[PDB]
Amino acid sequence: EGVEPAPWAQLEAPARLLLQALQAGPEGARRGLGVLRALGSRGWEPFDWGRLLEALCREEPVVQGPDGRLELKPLLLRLPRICQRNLMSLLMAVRPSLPESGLLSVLQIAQQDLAPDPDAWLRALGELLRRDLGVGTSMEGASPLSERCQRQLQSLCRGLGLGGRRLKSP
Amino acid sequence: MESLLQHLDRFSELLAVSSTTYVSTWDPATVRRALQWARYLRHIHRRFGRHGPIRTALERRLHNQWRQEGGFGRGPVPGLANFQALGHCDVLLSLRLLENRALGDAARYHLVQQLFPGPGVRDADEETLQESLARLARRRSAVHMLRFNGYRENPNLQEDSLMKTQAELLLERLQEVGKAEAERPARFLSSLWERLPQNNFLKVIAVALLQPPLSGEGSQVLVHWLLGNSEVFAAFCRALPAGLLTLVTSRHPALSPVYLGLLTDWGQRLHYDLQKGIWVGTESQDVPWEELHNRFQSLCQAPPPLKDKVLTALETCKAQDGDFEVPGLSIWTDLLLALR
Amino acid sequence: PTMLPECFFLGADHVVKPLGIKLSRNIHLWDPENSVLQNLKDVLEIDFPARAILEKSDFTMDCGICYAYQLDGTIPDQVCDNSQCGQPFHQICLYEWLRGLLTSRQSFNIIFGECPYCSKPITLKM
Amino acid sequence: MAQDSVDLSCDYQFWMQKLSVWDQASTLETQQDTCLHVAQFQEFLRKMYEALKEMDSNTVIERFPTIGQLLAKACWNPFILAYDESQKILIWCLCCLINKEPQNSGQSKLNSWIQGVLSHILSALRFDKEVALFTQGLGYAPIDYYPGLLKNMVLSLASELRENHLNGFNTQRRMAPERVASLSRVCVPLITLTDVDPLVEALLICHGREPQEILQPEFFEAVNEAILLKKISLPMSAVVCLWLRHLPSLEKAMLHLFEKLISSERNCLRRIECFIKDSSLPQAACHPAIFRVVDEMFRCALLETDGALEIIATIQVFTQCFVEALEKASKQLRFALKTYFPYTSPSLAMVLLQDPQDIPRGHWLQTLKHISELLREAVEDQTHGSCGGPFESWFLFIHFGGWAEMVAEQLLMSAAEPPTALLWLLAFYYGPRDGRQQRAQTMVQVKAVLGHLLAMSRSSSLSAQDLQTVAGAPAQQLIRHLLLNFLLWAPGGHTIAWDVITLMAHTAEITHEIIGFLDQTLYRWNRLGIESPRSEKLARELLKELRTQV
Ligand SMILES: [Zn+2]
Ligand SMILES: [Zn+2]
């Protein structure tokens, strides 16, 4: 009746194993790295990031919020929140060997443009991946942090004698 | 050694009268004397309360007190229940005086002023009475809040948290009677059986039979008591659910041959009606087919040492009533058919 | 590439320390006009072995969940009944893994499930 | 001694009109709102306690109108009565309202009512019936089983969470998330009760399989405040789990480190190190998400101020801690440094990680002269396949103390024929974003200054005005720091240090700067085990006396 299958049920077995590993708390990202060396070791030495980053954007339906509202979510927002955070950490780790076309489709989801109740950690890891590609200078105040934190940190640094270095260039 | 007897019994008398409505003559002097004595006992419990003849002497005194009173007639007074309560005797006294409506005004003021002086004494080496009562209030609040926001009556009673607590208390209370050796445990248990609610008590026995040892002499006593007293075991097996009795019986093989015997007698007083394909009883208190099937199914879904026992007890009772292989003739054939 | 790499050492704490020391002392001698090997050999002041064991190179003998040996006294003992996986595990790791999956079913003290790596029947007796 | 009633008499009506809404908190919204406002209620009660304490009962009618109703509503709400000291203060206030000698019957009714509410707080059986009956039969009072009862409820719930966690995607009873959120609301008032920490630790570790959070951020804020004030003492797995599922709690932790270096413990780097090590941030910053967030905040601060020495020294300390935690607990399967420091060439970091404890004191020069080459290549030859810019190479180079600070002290040792690469590094340290035309002028100024200082050192013990001449711009902090290192190094010092310090310390900012310099220098020396006791005692005395002037 109320049995729910795992949202990585229909995926390629190695991807399934990776997403099973990342589930496991803060040691999820290290375990993701161990998984990738344990597939470099096996018969399929390459790992199909380009297939996983399509599956991460593929949409399926859910009914959340009120009793009745149909909405379409991608995988990245449908799989467990610690799998999410340890994913994006692992994509920071292996960014150079990833296709940009897939990454940008992922980062657009992570940005969560026009959503209530966002994931601050997903948005922040989005920003930190954009900055590392070099397509998210963005000409904004788009920083990983909150406006609250950035303001409370201006408020304290104001109470300190500014240094003779010149790092901002007017 | 002998010096502490007259201290402790006098304090116990004062404590027992604390809860009683004769408080007219009391004064600040009596209350000060009470609480300094209580501090002395709490100091003893800290200093030389472990690993000596003094601890066992005090335990003899306490348990002898609680059995010479017994709990019959003139007063079911608790008293300080055990040697660990020596370390918080002061709190008991203070609470009993705060519950006594009959306390005089000046006594009440002196008391509460001595319990809750304020933050003038925020710095103290020994965990004082004010902190003790505060911590108690926090715990009571915590218990209320967990009970009504997060707690669920678990169906596997042995893993529940209330029953497990009651059980550990019972086991400790049997251990002390065993060490006392004055009256036999069975007499205490028989008196309990008359005194308190039966349905609750039986679940608690069931649960205490499965808690592992912590000092299983406790469970070893209850099995003897149950096998001695048939009437309680008639309602034991009748009231509880199936898996609990199954685990009990698998833990204690001495309960198995009687339990099947209890079930074997409840089947035999059923009768089959042809129009509705169901065994039924004559009297209203005869176990139905569904409950009895549940019990035998639980017994069969068990370790192998009991499966063969129940299976042989069923086959020997089938053949005893004609070795039929067709329904409408033998409850035992019908059971063995329904298990498969 | 020929520039200095991020490099570090695994193995015995008593053997590794002088290597880190020698690296620290000689790291300024790196030169990106030679080869990586021809720089490493005169930096660490040693030569390499060419396949001291080519058959039994190494089989990773770690938990295959936590990737550690020595989790709380326990050893990698529970293995796969398979020629192609042979992957050791721990009791605790493999129990926490199998208790999740939908395929797995628990008898009295037994759990049957799929080996994480190869998805073949594997049995765990607590 | 101005108002004495008005603000408190307003807050009173506020609180009484809030308590009446709350009313025993048997729902979600009442519970959340209580969990928010309870702290301010605590402070309100302290002020009310002072007010009723200084005066007496039954004579005065200031707030005696509804004080009863207030203290009752407070008492029958258990989210209040389980917060830190709220129960103790409500007890105090009821003790203040009592009277020794009642005269009118109303005061006697009051005293009876006070005993009643006190009895409700301490000793009422507002629990399941049969357990009270059973215990009363066995002759156990609530005070001698409630602890074990609490303990057993907590273990039960904690096991249940663990089993709902292990049963991820399995055909079994799923712990309803209403219950998990309920427990998370209950943990908030009684976070500082030791008899509940298992339930906290279990809630943090047992995230489970949901896409949304089931706990609400009041839980996380509560736990974090308690972790940082040292009131709960969890293990490290749980505070990492906390950071890593509530990002504002990790920002709020890193701010609580900045108050320690800005306000409280300016230039007591031993105390900064003690706070950092007791905190879990080094251990937690081995997850790159957390190291990236932490460096982003360090960056914001390097920029708001224009290169504050205090933040610089704090970063150096943090980095040392983080390194000696990464090494410890990154044996198998460790992340590559370009994952923590992604904005630079890995070569440079792999040089700068190498500690100078490991190297002889004489071979520091070669290593610095190599680092200068790599920074110069990375800045000046800014071609594709390199750093993002000069600021990035600087911000890295600053993370690794020892090297950045050792520069001047090696210039003085080689002041005769100064190395141009060290001059470059020093000018880079005290100013990036300058351009080669600026850098050359800076370096030649420094070279002339080194000539004069070497002349003065090889001369006898001379005045302070001869030094103030060369001290007399865009290169002032550099010359100040170089001159301080001259004082500590040369044996001509420990005689005329005061004469220069007094002249340089015009303002308080220069004083703070020199204090920071000297604390950093002693931390550095005591760490590397390099010391001349003359310079140690000299610097300690100057620091002691200047910390009074500020
Ligand atoms: Zn393991
Ligand atoms: Zn396998």
UniProtKB/Swiss-Prot annotation, chain A:
Record note on quaternary structure: Belongs to the multisubunit FA complex composed of FANCA, FANCB, FANCC, FANCE, FANCF, FANCG, FANCL/PHF9 and FANCM. The complex is not found in FA patients. Interacts with FANCC and FANCD2.
Protein name: Fanconi anemia group E protein
Known disease link: Fanconi anemia complementation group E: A disorder affecting all bone marrow elements and resulting in anemia, leukopenia and thrombopenia. It is associated with cardiac, renal and limb malformations, dermal pigmentary changes, and a predisposition to the development of malignancies. At the cellular level it is associated with hypersensitivity to DNA-damaging agents, chromosomal instability (increased chromosome breakage) and defective DNA repair.
Residues shown, of full length: 12 to 181 of 536
PTM comment: Phosphorylated.
Superkingdom per UniProt: Eukaryota
Location in or out of the cell: Nucleus
Function: As part of the Fanconi anemia (FA) complex functions in DNA cross-links repair. Required for the nuclear accumulation of FANCC and provides a critical bridge between the FA complex and FANCD2.
From Swiss-Prot, chain B:
GO cellular component, one term: nucleoplasm
Domain of life: Eukaryota
GO terms, biological process: DNA damage response; interstrand cross-link repair
Pfam families: FANCF (PF11107)
Swiss-Prot/TrEMBL keywords: DNA damage, DNA repair, Fanconi anemia, Nucleus
Effect of substituting F236R: Reduced monoubiquitination of FANCD2
Transcription regulation in keyword set: no
InterPro entries: FANCF (IPR035428), FANCF_C_sf (IPR038505)
Cell compartments where the protein resides: Nucleus
Keyword ATP-binding attributed: no
Outcome of mutating L329A: Strongly reduced monoubiquitination of FANCD2
Disease: Fanconi anemia complementation group F: A disorder affecting all bone marrow elements and resulting in anemia, leukopenia and thrombopenia. It is associated with cardiac, renal and limb malformations, dermal pigmentary changes, and a predisposition to the development of malignancies. At the cellular level it is associated with hypersensitivity to DNA-damaging agents, chromosomal instability (increased chromosome breakage) and defective DNA repair.
Assembly notes: Belongs to the multisubunit FA complex composed of FANCA, FANCB, FANCC, FANCE, FANCF, FANCG, FANCL/PHF9 and FANCM. The complex is not found in FA patients. In complex with FANCA, FANCG and FANCL, but not with FANCC, nor FANCE, interacts with HES1; this interaction may be essential for the stability and nuclear localization of FA core complex proteins.
UniProt protein name: Fanconi anemia group F protein
From Swiss-Prot, chain C:
Annotated binding of Zn(2+) 2, by residue: C80, C85, C115, C118
Compartments it resides in: Cytoplasm; Nucleus
Gene: FANCL
Protein name as it appears in the record: E3 ubiquitin-protein ligase FANCL
Outcome recorded upon mutating Y67A: Loss of interaction with UBE2T
Record disease entry: Fanconi anemia complementation group L: A disorder affecting all bone marrow elements and resulting in anemia, leukopenia and thrombopenia. It is associated with cardiac, renal and limb malformations, dermal pigmentary changes, and a predisposition to the development of malignancies. At the cellular level it is associated with hypersensitivity to DNA-damaging agents, chromosomal instability (increased chromosome breakage) and defective DNA repair.
Residues of the full protein shown: 245 to 370 of 375
Stated role: Ubiquitin ligase protein that mediates monoubiquitination of FANCD2 in the presence of UBE2T, a key step in the DNA damage pathway. Also mediates monoubiquitination of FANCI. May stimulate the ubiquitin release from UBE2W. May be required for proper primordial germ cell proliferation in the embryonic stage, whereas it is probably not needed for spermatogonial proliferation after birth.
PTM characteristics: The RING-type zinc finger domain is monoubiquitinated in the presence of UBE2T and UBE2W.
Superkingdom assignment: Eukaryota
Transmembrane segments: none
Coiled-coil segments on the chain, per record: none
Secretion signal span: none
Comment field on protein domains: The UBC-RWD region (URD) region mediates interaction with FANCI and FANCD2.
Recorded consequence of changing F8A: Impairs interaction with FANCI and FANCD2
Zn finger intervals (RING-type): 63-119
UniProtKB/Swiss-Prot annotation, chain D:
Effect of L546P: In FANCC; loss of activity; loss of CDK1-binding and IFNG-induced STAT1-binding; abnormal EIF2AK2 activation and augmented cell death
Residues forming coiled coils: none
Summary of the tissues where the protein is detected: Ubiquitous.
This protein's GO CC annotations: chromatin; cytoplasm; cytosol; Fanconi anaemia nuclear complex; nucleoplasm; nucleus
GO biological process, one term: protein-containing complex assembly
InterPro entries: FANCC
Compartment(s) where it occurs, according to its Swiss-Prot or TrEMBL record: Nucleus; Cytoplasm
Pfam families recorded: Fanconi_C
Keyword Cytoplasm attached: yes
DNA repair found in the keyword field: yes
Record's keyword terms, sorted: Cytoplasm, Disease variant, DNA damage, DNA repair, Fanconi anemia, Nucleus
General function of this protein: DNA repair protein that may operate in a postreplication repair or a cell cycle checkpoint function. May be implicated in interstrand DNA cross-link repair and in the maintenance of normal chromosome stability. Upon IFNG induction, may facilitate STAT1 activation by recruiting STAT1 to IFNGR1.
Disease field: Fanconi anemia complementation group C: A disorder affecting all bone marrow elements and resulting in anemia, leukopenia and thrombopenia. It is associated with cardiac, renal and limb malformations, dermal pigmentary changes, and a predisposition to the development of malignancies. At the cellular level it is associated with hypersensitivity to DNA-damaging agents, chromosomal instability (increased chromosome breakage) and defective DNA repair.
The protein's name: Fanconi anemia group C protein
Gene from which the chain derives: FANCC
